[PDB]
Amino acid sequence: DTVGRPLPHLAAAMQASGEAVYCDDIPRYENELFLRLVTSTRAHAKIKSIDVSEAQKVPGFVCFLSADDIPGSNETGLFNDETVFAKDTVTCVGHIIGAVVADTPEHAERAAHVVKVTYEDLPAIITIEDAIKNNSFYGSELKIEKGDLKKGFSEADNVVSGELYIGGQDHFYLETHCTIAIPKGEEGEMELFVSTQNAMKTQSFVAKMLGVPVNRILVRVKRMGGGFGGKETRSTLVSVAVALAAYKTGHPVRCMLDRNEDMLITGGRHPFLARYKVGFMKTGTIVALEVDHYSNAGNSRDLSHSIMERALFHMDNCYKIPNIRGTGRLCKTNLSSNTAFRGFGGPQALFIAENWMSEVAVTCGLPAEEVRWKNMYKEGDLTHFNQRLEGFSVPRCWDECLKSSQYYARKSEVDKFNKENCWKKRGLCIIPTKFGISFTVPFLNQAGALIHVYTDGSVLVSHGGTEMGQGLHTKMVQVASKALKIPISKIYISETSTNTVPNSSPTAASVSTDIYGQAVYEACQTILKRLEPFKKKNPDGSWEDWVMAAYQDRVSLSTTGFYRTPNLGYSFETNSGNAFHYFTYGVACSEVEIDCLTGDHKNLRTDIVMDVGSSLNPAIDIGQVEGAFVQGLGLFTLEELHYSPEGSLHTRGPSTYKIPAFGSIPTEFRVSLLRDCPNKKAIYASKAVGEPPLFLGASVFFAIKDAIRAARAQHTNNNTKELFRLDSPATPEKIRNACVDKFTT
Amino acid sequence: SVLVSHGGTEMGQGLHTKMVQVASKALKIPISKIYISETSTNTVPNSSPTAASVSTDIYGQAVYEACQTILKRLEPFKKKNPDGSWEDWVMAAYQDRVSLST
Amino acid sequence: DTVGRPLPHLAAAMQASGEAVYCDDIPRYENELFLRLVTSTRAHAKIKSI
Amino acid sequence: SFVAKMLGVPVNRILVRVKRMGGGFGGKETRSTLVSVAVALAAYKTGHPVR
Amino acid sequence: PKQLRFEGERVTWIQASTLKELLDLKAQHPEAKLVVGNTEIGIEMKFKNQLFPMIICPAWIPELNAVEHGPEGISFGAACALSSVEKTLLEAVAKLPTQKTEVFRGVLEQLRWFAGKQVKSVASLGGNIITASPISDLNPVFMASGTKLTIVSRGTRRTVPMDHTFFPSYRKTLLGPEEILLSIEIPYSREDEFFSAFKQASRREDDIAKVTCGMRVLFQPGSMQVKELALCYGGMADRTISALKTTQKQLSKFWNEKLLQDVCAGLAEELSLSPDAPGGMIEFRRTLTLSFFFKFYLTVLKKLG
Amino acid sequence: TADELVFFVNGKKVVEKNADPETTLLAYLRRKLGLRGTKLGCGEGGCGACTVMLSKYDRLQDKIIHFSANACLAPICTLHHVAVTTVEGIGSTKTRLHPVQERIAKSHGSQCGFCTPGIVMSMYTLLRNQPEPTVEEIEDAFQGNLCRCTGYRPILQGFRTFAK
Amino acid sequence: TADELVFFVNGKKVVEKNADPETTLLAYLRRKLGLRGTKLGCGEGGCGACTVMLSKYDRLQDKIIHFSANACLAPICTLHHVAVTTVEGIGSTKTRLHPVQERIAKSHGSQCGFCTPGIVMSMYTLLRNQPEPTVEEIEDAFQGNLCRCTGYRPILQGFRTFAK
Ligand SMILES: Cc1cc2nc3c(=O)[nH]c(=O)nc-3n(C[C@H](O)[C@H](O)[C@H](O)COP(=O)(O)OP(=O)(O)OC[C@H]3O[C@@H](n4cnc5c(N)ncnc54)[C@H](O)[C@@H]3O)c2cc1C
C-alpha cells in the first residue's frame, strides 16, 4: 500500500531523460503533411476576398482549406456559436480563416504567410467598457442574492464602494496546442493523437465537422506538457482544422502551434471588471455587500457562463455576510474567446472580495488579520448560496500558519524596517481561501474506468482522466495498488482513449482524483469479487496463481467502473441545493519588500498551510500547492497581457509576457499540509488540490499593497484611512506609480 | 452511435458483419448506427484465438449480453419517454449520468 | 432486424475498391525499417558459425 | 504474451491490434508469432518502428 | 580553417575563415548579413518575415574574438560572447582597484538580469551594439562611457568613441554599408570618475518603452565640481539617446541638492513623452528616468565622500 | 560544388552534405536525427525547453570549452566542428540516468515534464564547467529556463546536493 | 546524365528522374505513389492479386490498346509512355464505385477481400476491350486470378449481368 506515501510521478524519470513522448515527438509517417492556420489581422471586418496566388507558388504547397472544404458542418463550439473556418466576417484578430497544408512545416508557414486576405472593417467592441456601451453580452445576467440589502446598508456605520479590474492571463503551458490526425481510409474512420484534457468533445467536434457518426473518431491522449484549463476546449480549434486536412487530403496531418500563434488564438483567463459596495460597522464587521461582475468573454460563449457562476459562488471567500447580492455579465467582444484557466472564475472573485475586505480593515483603522477573522465563517454556517459548511478547517490553517510563520513577531520587524528605511518598504499579509469542489454543471460529475488483468497477473488500468503533469495516473496506480492489494509494479496505465472509456468529462475542476479514483476503486472491487473463490481454494497461492486459475476456469478478468458524485444540484432560482461536494481550504502568509524608486520588489518569504485531507501522495500534493501558488503570484504580480487599441495582442512570447522564473519565488518558501483532517467525502479521505491553492498567490499581491501604503504615508499625504485603487496585476509600473513622491510629481 | 468490440478477429468469414447483425437486433436499432473498427488487446483481454468455428457462437453471445446490460440502463428513460427516439433516451441517460459502456 | 437476411460483408465495398486496409497497406513511418528472416538451409545440423 | 516474454516485460505493455486478415484459415492461429516476435525484437533493439 | 559555403532553398551562407575574406565579401556584397549568435537575426527571419539571401559568419576570424588588456581599458573582438565579456570583467573587477573598474561594474550590472546562460553564451558583443535596439541595455552604457569602437572595411580602418551620433535613426547606426565592427574597448575608470547603470524591471513591447540607462560623472580633482556628465538612456525613443542638453547645464557645477533638482527638471523636459508616445507607460517612464538619476546622485555622494 | 557541414551529436559524427542556412539545430535534431528529447517551447530564446550543450575547441585557451545554448536559435551552419550534447546523450532509463536526471526525478522537480530536458541540460552544463558549484551558481544556471508546473522550489532543492 | 522515365497512373502524369531498373511496378505503386490498392500475393505471376491495366498507343493498329498485367513482374523501365490503371483509378466509396466493384461487392464475391482488387481489374480490362462479353470470355478473364475464400461461384454469378 503506497497511498499516503510520497511516490514520485511515475513518468518523472522518462521526462528527465527525454524518453517521455509528447504529441509532436511521435514520428511522422513517410507521407505525413503539415498545416498552418491562416488567421485574421483585423478584430471585426468583412472578408471581401482571399487570394492564394502567391501561396500556391511556395515549394511543397499542397492546398488551402476554407469553409467550403468542410464536408459536414462548419458550426462548432461548446454552444454551437462558432465556425471551424470563418466564412463572411471575422470577429477577432486571431480568428481562423483557413489553413495551408504543405510537405514541411516551413513551407506551410511561408505559404500561410503570403495568403492575401481583403477586409472591410466593421464596428469593433474590444473592452468591457466598449461592450456595456453597446449592450453587448452573451445571454442574461446571473446573480445570487441572500437576505436583503437596505436594512444592512442602513444598519452599517461605514459604507465603501468602487470599481476594480483584474487582468487576464495566458496559460503558458510549456507545450503548446498540437494535433496529429490519421485518416484510416475506411468508413470515415480517423485516429487522432492530441494534447487535450477533453477527448470526448474533441471526438464530437471532429465528427460533426466531418459529418460522420462519433463512433468513427478515435481520440488518444498520452499526456500533455501542461494544460491548466487552456486545453479543456480551445484545443479543438487546431484539432478540427487538422482533421479536415486529413480528410480532404487522405494524408496523416499534424500541427503544433508556435508560442505566438498559441497566445493569440487559444484564448486565456477571463479579465474581470467589478463595481462593488460594502457596508460595515467600525468593528470591521461586514453587514452588507454588493458586487457587479463583468468579464471579457471574447468572440464566443465557451465556458464563460459556468465561469461567472463559479465567480459568483466565490464572491464571499471565507467571510459570512448576512445581506449579500452579487451579479455577473459576460461581455461579448471582438477578442479571442477566453476559456478555462486554473481557478475557473474563483480567483477573480476571491480577489475582488479580498480587495473590499482589505479596505474594510483600513477604513476602520484596525489590524487586517483582526477584521478578516471577525468576518470569517464558523463551523456549520451557510454560504451566500445556502450550502452548509461542514468540516470547516480554515481556522486550523489560519492559527497554525500564523504560528509557524511567526507572523506577529515578523509584523513587528516589518514595521521597524518601514521606519528605518525611506525608499524601501516591506509588507506582510495573511490570507485565507476556500474553493468549492465539483463541476457546477451536475452531469459532468461522472467518471468511468476500464481494467484488464492479463493472465500473467499484470494489470492495465484505463480511465476517463488525462495526464497533464498533475500526476493523476500516479494517484490512480496508487489507488488501484491498494484496492487490489498488490504492488504498484504490477499495475500500469498507458494512455487515455475514447475507445476505452467513452463520453468522459474533460479532465478538470480538480475532481479527477476524486471521481476516476472512485471509478477505478469500484472496478478493482469487481475484480476482487471474481477472484475471491480462487483466493479461498488456495490461500497461500500468489496473486498470479489465482489469476491464472480464474482464467482457466473461464472467469472474466475485465471490468468497467463507474462513479457519479452524490447529492448535487444548485438552482439559481430558489438559490438552494448543493453546488459542491465539499470545499478545500488553505491559508498563506507572504512578506515582500518593494522598491519605491523602481517599482520592483522581492518576495522575501511565504508560508502556506493547505487542507488536502489525508493526501494520497503528499509529494504530489505539495507540488500542486507550490505550482498553483506560483501561477497565482504570476497572475497577481507579473503576468500582463497587452493589446493595441485595435484589439491586437502585442505580448506574444516570453520576451514580453513574463511568467514567474526561478528567481521569482519567495526566498523562504514553506508549504505544509494540515494534519488529521480526513475528508469522508472523497476517495481514501483525500481532497481535490489542483485549483484551490492558486488564489493564495494573492497573499503576495496584498503584502505588496501593504508596503505601497507605508510608502504613501511616507512621501505622500497623511490619510490613515485613505483608500487608493490598485488593480491586478500589480506590475512594477503600477507599484511605482502608486509610490507618489517628489518625482512622480 | 454505437461502437462494438469483441475478442474475435475478421479474416473474411464475415464475423464482424454477423456481430453487427446480432447487436442491431438485440438493441433493436438499425445496423447503420452500430460499428466495429478492429480487434485489440486493450479492449478485450485474454481472448481465445478466433478459431474452431465457434466465434459467431461465443462473441455473438458476449455481444448480446452487453447489449442487454445497455438496454437495462436505458429502460427507465424509454418509459418516461415512449415516443422518444433512441438518440433521445441515450442523451437522457448520459445527462442523468448513467454509464453507457459495458 | 437484419438477422436471417443476406446482408453482404460490411467491408466488401471497400475491399472491391482497394480502400480496405490490410497490415502492409498501413503507411510506413519516416523512420520505419525492414526485416528479413534468415532461415536454415539444412534439416538438422549444428551451427558451426554465422 | 510471446512478444512480452521474449522482451521480458509485463504483458500489460504490449498492445496488439488486428484490423483484418487477407485470410487465415488457421495458419495464423499461432505460427504468426514466428514473424511477430522477430519484428518486435528488431523494434526493441533498434528503437525504430519495424515491419 | 578554410572558408565554407552552404546553399539552401532561399539563402546562401559563407563561413569566412579570415578577416581578409570577410572584408572582401562585405565589400563584394554590402547588403549581406553577418551572423554570430543569430539571437537577433533568427528572430527577424522567424517573426519579422525577413529574407536575407546573403549571410556571412565571422565567428572563426581571429580578431573579432581577441581580448586585449591595454592602458586604456580592455578590448574584445566584436564577435566575443557576452558570457566572455562577463567573465573577463569579473576577473578585472576582482583583481584591479575599484577606482579603475567603474564602467566595468556598470556593464556587469546590465548583464545580470539579462536573458539567461544560453543567450549570453552565443550572443556576441558586436551583435548587440549594431542591432541598435531602442531598448538595448548595453549601448546606453557604451555611449555613457564613450566606449571605443574600432570599425573596419577592406582597406579603411578607424576608431571612435560611441556617442549620440552613432545611432542616426531607428535600427540604423553610423556604420558604412561595407563596414564591419572589429572590436570594442571598454574604458578603464579614471580617478574622480564614477559610473552607474539601471534598467526597468519589466518589458511589455518588442523593442520600445523599457527604460534602461548608463550614467557617468567626472569631477575635478579633490573637489565636488563636475568636469563631465553623461546621461544616456534607452527605452525613451526609437533609439539610444543622451540628455546632452541637461548634462551640459551642469558642467563645472557642484554636486548637491540643487544640481539634483536641476537635472531632474532638465530630464522631465528634455526627455519629455507625448500622451501618444509609442509604448505607453508615460507616467512610469518619466518617473524612472528621474528616479534612476536620483540613485546615481545618491550613489555618487557616497563615492565622493 | 557545396561544402559539407560536419559536426557531432552525442558523440556520433554527423555529415550534412546539403546544409540549409535557414535550418535551426532544434529542427535538425528533432526531424533529421529523430532526437525528440529537445523541445520547442517558444522559438524566441526565453524558455530554454530547447537547451543543449555545445562544445568547441578554442585556438587559444587550448582546452575545449563547454557552454549551453538555445537550439531553437542556433543555425546548424554555425556548428561546423562543434560537438552537440542533448538530454539523450547523458543518460536514459533503458540504460542509466545521469545523476542530474535521477536527482530532479526523485526530488519531484518534474511534473508535466516538458521543461525537464532543458533544465537537465542547463545543470549538466554547469557541472561540466564546475564539478562542485555554489547554490548561487546553481540558481543562475536556470536564468533562461522556465517551468510552469513546479514553482521551481523542488528543482533547486534537488540540485543542492551538488553544491558546497 | 540519365533519361527521365515518364508514364501515367490513373490519369496523372508521373515523372521519375532516377528510375531504378530493378524496380517493379507493384513496389513503385505501393511505396512511392502510396496506392496500396494493388497487392502482393506471390511475386511470381500466378495469383493476380497485383493485377492492373496497362494502356499504350501502338504505331500500327493506330488505336490505344488495353491489356491487363501483373505489376509484381512489370519493370517500371518498360513503362515509358504507358498509362497505368489501378483499382483506385476506376471508382471508390468516397465517390462512386465502378459497376464492376459494385457488382462483385453485392454478389458476395468478396470475403477476406485480398484478391478482389485484381479480379476487379481483370474484369475492368475485359469490359474495356469488349463492352458485352460472353460468359466464356468472362470466365477466361480470370485464368490468372486466384481466390482462396469464395469458391469462385459468387464472383462469376455477379459478372453474368455483363454478358449476352
Ligand atoms: C531570450 C533573449 C533575451 C535577451 N535580453 C537582452 C537584454 O536584456 N538587453 C539587451 O540589450 N539585449 C538583449 N538581447 C539581445 C541580444 O543581446 C542580441 O540579440 C545579440 O547580442 C545579437 O548578437 P548575436 O551574436 O546573436 O547576433 P546576430 O543575430 O548575428 O545579429 C546581429 C545583427 O548585428 C550585425 N552584426 C553582427 N556582428 C557584427 C560585426 N562584427 N560587425 C558589424 N555588424 C554585425 C548583423 O548583421 C545583424 O544586423 C536578448 C536576446 C534573446 C534571444
Ligand SMILES: Nc1nc2c(c(=O)[nH]1)N[C@H]1C(S)=C(S)[C@@H](COP(=O)(O)O)O[C@H]1N2
Ligand atoms: N502540473 C500540472 N498541474 C496541474 C494542471 C497542469 O496542466 N499541469 N492543470 C490544473 C487545472 S487547471 C485542474 S482543473 C486540475 C486538473 O486535475 P485533477 O482533477 O486531477 O486534480 O489540475 C491542476 N494542476
Ligand SMILES: Nc1nc2c(c(=O)[nH]1)N[C@H]1C(S)=C(S)[C@@H](COP(=O)(O)O)O[C@H]1N2
Ligand atoms: N473467408 C474466410 N473464411 C473462413 C477463414 C478465413 O481465413 N477466410 N478461416 C476458417 C477457419 S480455419 C475457422 S476455425 C473459422 C473461423 O471463425 P468463425 O469462428 O467465426 O466462424 O472460419 C473459417 N472460414
Ligand SMILES: O=C(O)c1ccccc1O
Ligand atoms: O465548475 C467548474 O469548475 C467547471 C469547470 C470546467 C467545466 C465546467 C465546470 O462547471
Ligand code: MOS
Ligand atoms: O482550468 Mo482546470 O477547470 S481544467
Ligand code: MOS
Ligand atoms: O484452423 Mo480454424 O481451428 S483457425
Ligand code: FES
Ligand atoms: S524554444 Fe524557448 S528558448 Fe528555445
Ligand code: FES
Ligand atoms: S514540469 Fe511542466 S513546465 Fe516544468
Ligand code: FES
Ligand atoms: S503477386 Fe501474384 S501474380 Fe503478382
Ligand code: FES
Ligand atoms: S476473398 Fe480472400 S482470396 Fe478472394
